[PDB]
Write a protein that binds this ligand. Sequence first.
Ligand SMILES: [Cu+2]
Ligand SMILES: [Cu+2]
Ligand SMILES: [Cu+2]
Length: 309
Amino acid sequence: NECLGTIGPVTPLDASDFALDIRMPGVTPKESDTYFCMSMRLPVDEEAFVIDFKPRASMDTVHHMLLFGCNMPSSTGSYWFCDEGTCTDKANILYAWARNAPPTRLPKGVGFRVGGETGSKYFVLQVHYGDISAFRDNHKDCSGVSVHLTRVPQPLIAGMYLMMSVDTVIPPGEKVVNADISCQYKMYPMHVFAYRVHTHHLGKVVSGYRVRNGQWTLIGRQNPQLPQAFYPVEHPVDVTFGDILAARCVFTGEGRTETHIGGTSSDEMCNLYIMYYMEAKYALSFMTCTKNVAPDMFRTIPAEANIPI
Ligand SMILES: [Cu+2]
Ligand SMILES: [Cu+2]
Ligand SMILES: [Cu+2]
């Protein structure tokens, strides 16, 4: 969007609410495929709730944008290159915008709990400039996100469920290898409202289900070779004590002359982010599954999970 000026990024809306305008401080990227970051310090030393995101992306030039909660940004400058990365501590993804992709909205009563003793103190924005054919120096970009914070305790708290395989091995050629992930859900109910799949250049399809009394209910199916936005769940799925979260990333060997789990694009990653909410009295902000606790259960995984789209 047009560049802010002197107006200031923090806007008080009342004694409970404030708005943050988190924007690049007028940047001009010189190479194609540049990653710019900046960070805003939360202006309250206490528990706040993030209850709305509005993207302020130039349709011309911004490919994807990521907003993260952490306590320690990588750099301290007004903006910096983040091929390096985002936060020194754990980066808690809050919001992922991609150019052409359905724009998910937070369900009524939902907040991301930030600040206080335990929450994030810092928002880190990350902007992917793609084709730099618009950036004929002819402009300075101020793309970013608007964020509505309240100190009012929200009845529903958002969280992030990450499922990643960490022992996977793809020999070269081997037309199909399956990374299977599965954990038994032991917490109070979560309502899954969005997912994001992330593989590197090998993965062909990634699929996530809740399985209850042997019934496979789809959470998401995506080609991981697309813009990695949070896609919206076709039917919001509850997950309950006794359920199994199961995921499968499907990988090809074809193309490789030597793969394992690592951070290098030469390495692979089978990741599924399930964004969810819980009742506030029960809410956990993060859960992880790195095991495969029920491998004999993938025997009845739906056909759809083994085929591209
Ligand atoms: Cu991008
Ligand atoms: Cu329900
Ligand atoms: Cu990766």
